[PDB]
Swiss-Prot record, chain A:
EC number: 6.3.2.4
Similarity-based family: Belongs to the D-alanine--D-alanine ligase family.
Gene3D superfamilies linked: 3.40.50.20, ATP-grasp fold, A domain, ATP-grasp fold, B domain
Binding locations of Mg(2+) 1: 270, 282
InterPro entries per record: ATP-grasp, ATP_grasp_subdomain_1, D-Ala_lig_Van_CS, D_ala_D_ala, Dala_Dala_lig_C, Dala_Dala_lig_N, PreATP-grasp_dom_sf
Source lineage: Bacteria, Thermotogati, Deinococcota, Deinococci, Thermales
Species name: Thermus thermophilus (strain ATCC 27634 / DSM 579 / HB8)
Name of the protein this chain belongs to: D-alanine--D-alanine ligase
Cofactor: binding comment: Binds 2 magnesium or manganese ions per subunit.
Gene: ddl
Length: 319, 312
């Protein structure tokens, strides 16, 4: 059994993708080779790929797509790419054409989960609670059924740019103009405040196993009398401090959504908890595999050791 | 302008794809090359591609995917494939990776429009009427909110294989067994009868313009009879407009890009959006081009506009 690991990509998550690849290479219980997509879109194979990993960034590759890779040597391909040309179904489609089994969501599920508007429409149709929202396309006069405050953001799941929290309708046009520079479609989500962020891992094909629930907390940077500067931190609470009832609901909601969307290998499902109400925010078809990443840490706490997690992901690709 | 037309495919629509390719190639107002995907999945380029085009079929190809082709030579790619590896977003994704502009729906729209389950969930939520249905996966207990008759069919299969018309609530298990041979997920759709089939074409990116509405009517079998295309369809102005508006709404919500033939069922006063075809036919007999001709858009102009839309 030989595995082909693909990491990097042209997206802003290039480096974090390499960091994940590092962790996967160090513990995957199968003979594995690495292939890297440089920030310029060209690929690096063999020793050049490993060298780039060691460098934490591959600005330039050697081979324009499609890479001269001996696909026949691999039983399963593990695409560890994030966002654009990563979780959007494009690489998944390429692998479908090559006839290669691969880890993670398929084409439809990947593309759908990457669209904040379309995946919510599907989830809402299936009875899964989501934050009230509306989709706006460039050129369309915005029609928002709810009052501010709300968040305006490009429709690409996980984006960290083009976001604006607006408190007045007179500020909507400016928020939309900003969001439209990143995606031709944006979504306007009713702002809930305060809220808690909860995340849960899922493992399996369509019908999965849920990990324990984790929570993300933010601690702002500050200047300490003796320690001087102390950096801000995103703290991971594992398991999340929740009453039994809420924990079970998020886990069930995550499993149901996963099932409806037909997700296949893994997923970290993010939720907003506010006023005692749960809302499924986003599904990440390709989570992090860094020793600091929520997904592997959650399953670890769920009795699934990292090496074992990677083993099961590879095996699931062959269904 | 330099256009690369791709036709054929591994799907059962391999031959009709070539037929429409012949048409497109004879009237596309731009220098255009042809690449053919043979039934065995291998590609045919240049001279051999043309030969296959003239033979109306290409059983086996020469180049394993991906082919040794320099895509630099083309400004726009026109994937004229149907179904699996055609309208399912796979080839589209390959093209996205090559960084090449291309005709038709992108990855998301193509993949969604080929999934009878997910597409209906989206349209139903959006307010577009769809025939009552349920989705079922291999191994999960069926729960049908309606009684026969109804159809059972694989969900992401852009083919006619594995489909069954169930009459007895006791034949269900059997029909699902068949469907599951082509997709671990199948859908059960209430059967409408009498039912009329209407079709309307759309052109443009996201916000498109509808062509006149057409109607498909089959003649008596003699070997099923000819598929008559009534254009415009014999409808009162009110229904025609509703068909067009619904088609345009679905098109928009799904973010379809270059074109689409939207099919509807009309049963006792009620319209139901049936299917959204992202890569329609282009033979002289195909509904899509004929519908737009009737709408004042000649075949050559239609092709010119599809190529241009790919760039915007």
């Amino acid at each position: 059994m030989r595995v082909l690991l693909i990491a990097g990509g042209v997206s802003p998550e290039h480096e974090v993708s390499l960091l994940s690849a590092e962790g996967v290479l160090r513990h995957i219980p199968f003979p594995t080779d690495l292939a890297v997509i440089a920030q310029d879109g060209r690929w690096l194979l063999g020793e050049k790929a490993l060298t780039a990993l060691e460098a934490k960034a591959a600005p330039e590759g050697e081979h324009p797509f499609p890479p001269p890779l001996s696909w026949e040597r691999y039983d399963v391909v593990f695409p560890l790419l994030h966002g654009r040309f990563g979780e959007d179904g494009t690489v998944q489609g390429f692998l479908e054409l090559l006839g290669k089994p691969y880890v993670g969501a398929g084409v439809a599920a990947s593309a759908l989960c990457m669209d904040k508007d379309l995946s919510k429409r599907v989830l809402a149709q299936a009875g899964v609670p989501v934050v009230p929202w509306v989709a706006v396309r460039k050129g369309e006069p915005p029609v928002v059924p709810f009052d501010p405050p709300f968040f305006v953001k490009p429709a690409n799941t996980g984006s960290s740019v083009g976001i604006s929290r607006v408190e007045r309708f007179q500020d909507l046009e400016a928020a939309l103009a900003l969001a439209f520079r990143y995606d031709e479609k944006a979504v306007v989500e009713k702002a809930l405040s305060p809220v808690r962020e909860l995340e849960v891992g899922v493992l399996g094909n369509v019908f999965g196993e849920a990990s324990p629930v984790g929570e993300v907390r933010y601690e702002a940077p500050f200047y300490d009398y003796e320690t001087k500067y102390t950096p801000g931190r995103a703290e991971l609470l594992i398991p999340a401090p929740l009453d039994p009832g809420t924990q079970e609901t998020v886990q069930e909601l995550a499993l149901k959504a996963y099932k409806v969307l037909g997700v296949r290998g893994m997923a970290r499902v993010d939720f907003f908890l506010a006023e005692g109400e749960l809302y499924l925010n986003e599904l990440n078809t390709i989570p992090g595999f860094t020793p600091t990443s929520m997904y592997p840490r959650l399953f670890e706490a769920g009795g699934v050791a990292y090496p074992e997690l990677l083993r099961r992901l590879v095996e699931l690709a062959l269904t």
